[PDB]
């Protein structure tokens, strides 16, 4: 997956020429070109130049051209991390994420993600899922591999998982639970809904839509109770979830709408009733291993179209750079 | 006649310091979250916004977590969700973010409005970007989020006057003269105006 | 005198002596003082009950119609008085001020019931 882009549209391979012109402009407070950060990025060949690029990405984010951090520039940088390590500094840049502001919502997430599994990279690979969950993604077939890893770590970590990591499972469970293809997507949706509707009566609602892209509607357990009716018209932690709620600050809710602690006999029966029909109508980690084989038809044909887009882009970009210097 | 050289020259010097070292958005828009004061102004905040400013985040510290700064995303004020069950939100067209702010925020953005199920083109500037009442509508269930389906008499002093007026005009004509309120529009007070019409202080 | 963004207002303006007020409705600016100059002088309002108990008001409505059509703002004590006149709708502050004393008397009647 590497030997395609490596015709990097050959340029200068220098750095002592470049790195002065990129902070003379900051000391004078000039706006900087959007291409010179990338030309710094496509000349890294040492681990100290990785940290040089990190300082300069930090200084490029705090700039008058705080926009124009283009996706192929990030793609060159993540190809630079794939060249050297792709073990810590890419993770640090994805986890800071505002000081640097990368955001590569592409197949670039999957290219960095699957290579973690090649060294199996558990604890360092878990965070990339946890930050792309906060992002909006998954208009791509990446839902299979994200769910693959997150159920690998479901069967690896087994606790209360934290105050908030129990919430940091659920959204990456739920938005890849848009799978109409199998009932395993509707199962991931259920396991998401269980442990995010579980924090609603534990701590409060605001923590769920604190930063992760959710919705402030307090009814989420019923949204699992209705997609299970969708299943029965077309899991076993919700059983402990609905009864664990039933066992022994700014209020947002209204005085006519009832608080959902008094409805736990209404949460027992509506859920314990329909599973008796799910019996009559109609493991997890092996299912996504079935899905890794059945799916992943490998759309690099769109990736190559983007490479063509960037070979269209940078040429007409540097044409105006040549004319801006002849205009003097 | 005496021409005022220093009194005219000083307006130029005050203009090139209202324009050059005027302080940017981070250095007059932050808030001490413990003491409820502000940097560079020091005047405390109203007590109808203490819980909402302690507890809920602002617009562009939330919306700096998206690629190309959330170029087509939907967002909605916090008390908009409390007062308006109908859809009222912002589509985005452009963000001009602050750069000097660590944990980058406090930009100026402008885009398309929707109010209570009614939207309109000609993307104007958005109000209350520094305010702590913001909540992001995610790209999941945005299609479920967007969902939506005379004549009053005159004052009695005019009622006696204009009847006598028509009786002088020639026809008594006891059809009741009515002023139209259908031509008068009834926007509420939460309705936002153009951010340009206010200036920064 | 250049007023930095001044507009018109129809206000009261005092001309009584001490402990005997005498208002005067006047079309003036927003920033010129209370007993100061104006644009047009209108029919005044005497707030004291006269012999055999009347409070006298004057309204030159043919010119009050002219000024707020020309773009005059109005004071809330003036809008109460036009509401009492019926040239305006009655003021909601006047209505709820009536209701506040009516609910105070609704309390007073229960108070008079409890002390017999």
């Amino acid at each position: 997956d590497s030997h395609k882009w490596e015709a990097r549209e050959k340029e200068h391979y220098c750095l002592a020429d470049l790195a002065s012109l990129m902070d003379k402009t900051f000391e004078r407070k000039l706006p900087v070109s959007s291409l010179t950060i990338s030309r710094l990025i496509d000349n890294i060949s040492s681990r100290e130049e990785i940290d040089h690029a990190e300082y300069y990405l930090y200084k490029f984010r705090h700039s008058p051209n705080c926009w124009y951090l283009r996706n192929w520039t990030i793609h060159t940088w993540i190809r630079q991390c794939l060249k050297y390590d792709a073990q810590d500094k890419a993770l640090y840049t994805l986890v800071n994420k505002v000081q640097y502001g990368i955001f590569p919502d592409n197949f670039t997430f999957n290219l960095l993600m699957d290579s973690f599994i090649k060294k199996e990279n558990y604890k360092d690979a878990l965070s990339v899922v946890f930050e792309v969950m906060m992002q909006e993604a998954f208009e791509v077939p990446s839902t299979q591999l994200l769910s693959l890893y997150v159920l690998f770590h479901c069967l690896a970590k087994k606790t209360d998982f934290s105050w908030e990591e129990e919430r940091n499972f659920g959204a990456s469970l739920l938005l890849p639970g848009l799978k109409q293809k199998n009932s395993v997507g509707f199962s991931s949706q259920l396991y998401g809904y269980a442990l995010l509707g579980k924090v609603e009566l534990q701590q409060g609602l605001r923590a769920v839509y604190h930063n992760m892209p959710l919705i402030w509607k307090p009814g989420y357990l019923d949204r699992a109770l209705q997609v299970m009716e969708k299943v029965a018209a077309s899991e076993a932690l919700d059983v402990l979830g609905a009864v664990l709620k039933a066992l022994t600050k700014l209020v947002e809710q209204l005085d006519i709408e009832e608080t959902e602690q008094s409805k736990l006999p209404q949460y027992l029966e509506r859920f314990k009733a329909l599973h008796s029909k799910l019996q009559a109508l109609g493991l997890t980690t092996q299912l996504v291993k079935e899905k890794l084989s059945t799916c992943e038809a490998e759309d690099i044909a769109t990736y190559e179209q983007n490479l063509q887009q960037w070979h269209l882009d940078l040429v007409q970009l540097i044409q105006r750079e040549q004319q801006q210097r002849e205009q003097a | 006649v005496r021409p005022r050289l220093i009194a005219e020259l000083a307006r130029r010097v005050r203009a090139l310091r209202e324009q050059l070292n005027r302080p940017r958005d981070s250095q007059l828009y932050a808030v001490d979250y413990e003491t409820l004061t502000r940097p560079f102004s020091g005047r405390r905040l109203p007590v109808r916004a203490w819980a909402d400013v302690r507890r809920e985040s602002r617009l562009l510290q939330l919306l700096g977590r998206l690629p190309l700064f959330g170029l087509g995303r939907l967002v909605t004020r916090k008390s908009w969700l409390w007062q308006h069950d109908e859809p009222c939100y912002w589509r985005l067209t452009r963000v001009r973010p602050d750069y000097t702010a660590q944990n980058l925020d406090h930009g100026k953005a402008w885009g398309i409005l929707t109010f209570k199920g009614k939207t309109e083109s000609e993307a104007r500037e958005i109000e209350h970007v520094m305010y702590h009442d913001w909540r992001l509508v995610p790209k999941h269930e945005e299609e479920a989020f967007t969902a939506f389906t005379a004549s009053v008499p005159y004052p009695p002093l005019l009622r006696a006057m204009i009847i006598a007026e028509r009786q002088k005009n020639g026809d008594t004509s006891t059809e009741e003269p009515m002023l139209n309120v259908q031509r008068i529009r009834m926007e509420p007070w939460d309705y936002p105006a153009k951010q340009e019409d206010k200036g920064r202080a | 005198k250049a007023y930095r963004g001044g507009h018109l207002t129809i206000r009261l303006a005092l001309g009584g002596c001490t402990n005997r007020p005498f208002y005067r409705i006047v079309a003036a600016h927003n920033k010129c003082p209370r007993d100061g100059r104006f644009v047009e002088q209108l029919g005044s309002y005497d707030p004291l009950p006269n012999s055999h108990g009347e409070k006298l008001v004057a309204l030159n409505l043919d010119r009050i119609r002219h000024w707020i059509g020309c773009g005059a703002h109005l004071s809330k004590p003036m809008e109460k008085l036009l509401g009492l006149a019926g040239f305006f709708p009655l003021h909601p502050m006047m209505i709820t001020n009536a209701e506040r004393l009516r609910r105070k008397r609704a309390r007073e009647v229960l108070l008079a019931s409890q002390k017999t």
Binding site: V251, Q253, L254, D255, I256 | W82 | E99, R102, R103, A106
Partner: peptide
């Protein structure tokens, strides 16, 4: 007013509230 509106204003102004009746009576002597 309907109580789905009265509850919203109560939710706005929870901690600072004065209890109240509805309409006043018809006549005051």
């Amino acid at each position: 007013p309907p109580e789905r509106e009265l509850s919203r204003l109560r939710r706005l102004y929870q901690g600072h509230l004065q209890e109240e009746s509805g309409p006043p009576p018809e006549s005051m002597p």
